[PDB]
Assembly symmetry: C2
Homo-oligomer: 92 residues x 2
Amino acid sequence: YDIRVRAKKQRCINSLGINTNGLIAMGLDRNKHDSSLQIWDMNYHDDSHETINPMFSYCTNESIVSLKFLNDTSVLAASTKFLKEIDVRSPN
Amino acid sequence: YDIRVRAKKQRCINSLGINTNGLIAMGLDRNKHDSSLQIWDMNYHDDSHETINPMFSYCTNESIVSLKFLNDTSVLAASTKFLKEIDVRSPN
């Protein structure tokens, strides 16, 4: 098909990763009131809205400039000052 | 395998539904501080804890006594006084 989606706050998408199990992550620029690593599934997305509803949100007030999906659960994200590895089964 | 899971507050599981896309719902008794329709995926469950982390929570202060998965997104839940149909793509 063809679907346009965006964050709650509209800002540049630096990085993008689509996993094997359909899970989609997003790397955005720096916004103090929104997460820069929003991970969600397209199967649970309401088609009536452009904004996404993220299952997992990380990296508030940061600028995720690169990300990669290592496996079905963990994501290796890179900010402008840090190099992170985030697992969706943990909040840390 | 074999995994035992439970709600944050331990109470009787009246109803249970496992969907085709791996999504699992749960019908519990009445607790005023916890949801009685907790929907989650087993792929994003931390194996180090017994308590579940629900992606979608509904029906607080109710006793879900029967539930059924109509399709990949909507669930037809039944409380002790109401008959509901809840879609996970909407908060209503």
